Amino acid sequence: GTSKLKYVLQDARFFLIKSNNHENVSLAKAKGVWSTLPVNEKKLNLAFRSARSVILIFSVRESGKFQGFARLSSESHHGGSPIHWVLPAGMSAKMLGGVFKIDWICRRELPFTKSAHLTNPWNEHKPVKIGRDGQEIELECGTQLCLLFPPDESIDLYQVIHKM
């Protein structure tokens, strides 16, 4: 069903997260963590305090797809286990902010062709696939986008609900 998912998404905030490669999304899916540049770290920490759920919707650059979505379970923190992010040439790990813990809601992919009818008011009503890393997605567009993903029957939202 979709009812627990709708409950988790109720009054949520949504952010488009771009990854340079599949390797970083794979790491995030395996370890339940994400990290970003300080500009987006500040936005996400503010959002985490502001709303019952903050949803990150992931898209690997040039893949033509979203790779899933996850809920922030923490603000960013430093000093944990280093994550061997495949950083681009020239970016040290020190350029990153802290690490956010996340709980995956859907690890299935969604092609951009399936979201062509959804526009994001916070990015000039451009198709929701279009946006910089960290672009906020307005509630209604973000909710409908998440509802387009194939159901992920491997995940049980019971434990997620208890964290709200």
Is 11 within any annotated ligand binding site? no
Task: List the interface residues with ligand QF2, window 110-139 (CB under 6 A).
Answer: 133
Nearest to 100 by CA among 39, 48, 52, 156: 48
Q: Does 76 bind ligand QF2 (CB under 6 A)?
A: no
Is 85 within any annotated ligand binding site? yes
Cα gap 71→86, rounded to integer Å? 22
Task: Determine the longest span between alpha carbons in the chain, in angstroms.
Answer: 45
Instruction: Based on DSSP, count helices (H) and strands (E) in the chain, helices before strands.
Output: 5, 10
- Window of 5-13, 46-54, 80-88, 118-126 that interacts with ligand QF2 by CB under 6 A: 80-88
Task: List the interface residues with ligand QF2, window 8-67 (CB under 6 A).
Answer: 18-20, 24, 34-37, 40
Is 103 within any annotated ligand binding site? no
Structure-token pair, residue 138: 């307005």
Cα gap 137→6, rounded to integer Å? 16
Compute the least distance from the CB of residue 19 to ligand QF2, in Å: 5
Q: Does 88 bind ligand QF2 (CB under 6 A)?
A: yes
- Closest to ligand QF2 by CB, 5 or 137: 137
In this structure, the chain runs to a length of 164
Is 53 within any annotated ligand binding site? no
Q: Where are the alpha helices (DSSP H) in the chain?
A: 3-9, 22-31, 38-50, 139-148, 158-163
Is 21 within any annotated ligand binding site? no
Cβ-proximal residue to ligand QF2, closest one: 36
Compute the least distance from the CB of residue 33 to ligand QF2, in Å: 8
Q: Does 1 bind ligand QF2 (CB under 6 A)?
A: no
Structure-token pair, residue 156: 């049980």
33 forms bridges with which residues in the sheet? 101
Which residues of this protein are in contact with ligand QF2, per CB under 6 A?
18-20, 24, 34-37, 40, 85, 87-88, 96, 133
Binding residues for RNA, as ranges, are 18-20, 34-35, 85, 133
